[PDB]
Symmetry: C2
Subunit: 303 residues, 2 copies
């Protein structure tokens, strides 16, 4: 037993005693450290590398700070490397999630997108650089993802999500987590329910963002189905339904980087808490809504 | 006005703009407007309807004029290039949507290219702010830092990639920023901020905005008050984040003034961090800095500090001074 006062905090066990005089009282400080302030470095991981433990170090101290699940700090990092996350959009919120997940040591990224990089994507889509223009988005994403973290394995699917139940189970494949917005959404949710895969939603704009509920899909939780069934409101409703009278005028969606990174950050944090259990995740059954104008927020229960 | 959608409510009412936003709302429009507006990108139009009346068509066009909803094809930017207007397009749409300072959309972006932001420290909070600012078309970035990239910086400091290990942070930073946005000028100072005002006024230089963390800090603040330079504070951890207040330093708001050893032993005590907390913090900052510089929309954080738990998502404001 070797007292590692958790490298987060500023200020043999038999070794410190003998080195000190050079017993219950030191025994007293060591033990009372069981108030979750002490490490037992005596454990090394049989999965993670020398490089990885170094690279993942500063967040590993963070898992160990809360240690909700009572594990050695690498076990948490282990639960990320064992994870497989599928992302069904690869511009907007999609590249920021991919980015921050790869940086965090997520095991696998399954990326799905049928688009290609345009110069107008560069202001907000963080995985694509000026020289990536003209590439297919998923190819650029993987290229970029591995330059950041070479231990992340990336599976890329150059296609859109069609409402084909046979194709989606292939696209979902053996995922451990799913990230998506807002029938194809519904077919996936269903796939997710069948394979017991946690699913997190999200969506919004520069004025206000939300990071939708988590569905654990372990059983013992409500699941997607249960949720399935001048007014500032009516034009809200009409817009999400895409009914626009634009005609031959070409109108584009107004988006910029700040709003995406905020929800992408809320999303990645919540996903990391779920996978690892280093701390409890708020967003199970809740929707967090935050104005980016006046910073008022609110919660929504789904179950 | 290519920022605005023309929305069709179920009952048939129309709203020109996605998020009024002070978008015009036409209630119970004549049958003729849905085909009218639908053809207004390009006298001319009355032709196409060949049920509607000629004078009734001009008033409609008349109206859309004083409502500031109609496009100005005659305006070209002498500041922005062909490439920038492309790359900045969608955020340009976002400015055109709220349009608080009543300007042509290009003008707002111009106000960004003309800006110079100095960032003190390229740690976690530091790297994300530089990035999103560069992406957003900030004119010039002044990076101040004496460190070099470590393998442990790679999990949270986003401007640094694996091949960047061992390099100077400000130089690795500049290489990365320029891969993302070649239009941003980057001035780099491989040094830490000493509490010498003689150097600090040199490091600040002709900055137009300052970002720093929650001492040198107080001199930078004094330099800022003296030169009328906005300063935004920030800070927190993986558990709760805070951003602001912003100090306008215009003389019509209260100023910054108005408001040991460790028994460490042989263990190395480190900063506990992961990326998610930083992105939220830089995005709140960047949005607030962009709104302040350009004025396309009003910034909340002037004189206020916003605090958000990342555990249970309770937030709270703290006033630091009144406008
Ligand atoms: Ni395309």
């Amino acid at each position: 037993v070797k007292p590692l006062i958790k490298e987060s905090h500023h200020i043999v066990p038999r070794i410190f005693k003998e080195l000190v005089s050079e017993e219950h009282l030191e025994g007293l400080v060591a033990g009372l450290a069981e108030r979750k302030l002490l490490q037992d470095n005596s454990f090394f991981s049989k999965v993670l590398s020398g490089e990885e433990v170094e690279r993942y170090n500063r967040q590993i101290l963070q898992f160990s700070l809360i240690d909700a699940d009572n594990q050695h700090p690498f076990v948490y990092q282990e639960r990320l490397k064992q994870s497989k996350v599928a992302i069904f959009g690869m511009g907007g919120w999609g590249t920021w999630c991919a980015l921050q997940l790869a940086m965090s040591g997520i095991g696998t990224l399954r990326l799905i997108d049928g688009d290609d990089v345009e110069l107008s994507n560069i202001n907000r889509q963080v995985l694509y650089r000026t020289d990536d223009v003209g590439k297919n988005k998923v190819d650029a994403a993987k290229d970029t993802i591995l330059a950041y973290n070479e231990n992340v394995h990336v599976e890329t699917f150059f296609e859109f999500a069609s409402p084909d139940r046979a194709r989606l189970e292939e696209l979902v494949g053996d995922s451990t987590f799913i990230i998506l917005a807002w029938t194809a959404e519904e077919i996936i949710h269903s796939i997710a329910k069948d394979k017991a895969i946690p699913v997190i939603e999200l969506g919004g704009d520069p004025l206000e963002i939300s990071v939708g509920p988590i569905y654990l899909n372990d059983g013992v939780h409500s699941g997607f189905d249960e949720v399935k069934n001048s007014d500032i409101r009516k034009f809200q409703e009409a817009r999400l339904k895409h009914s626009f009278i634009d005609g031959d005028r070409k109108v584009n969606a107004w988006q910029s980087a700040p709003s995406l990174s905020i929800m992408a950050g809320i999303v990645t944090d919540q996903v990391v808490k779920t996978i690892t259990g280093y701390d409890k995740p708020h967003l199970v059954g809740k929707k967090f809504i935050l104005s980016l104008q006046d910073f008022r927020s609110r919660e929504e229960e789904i179950f």
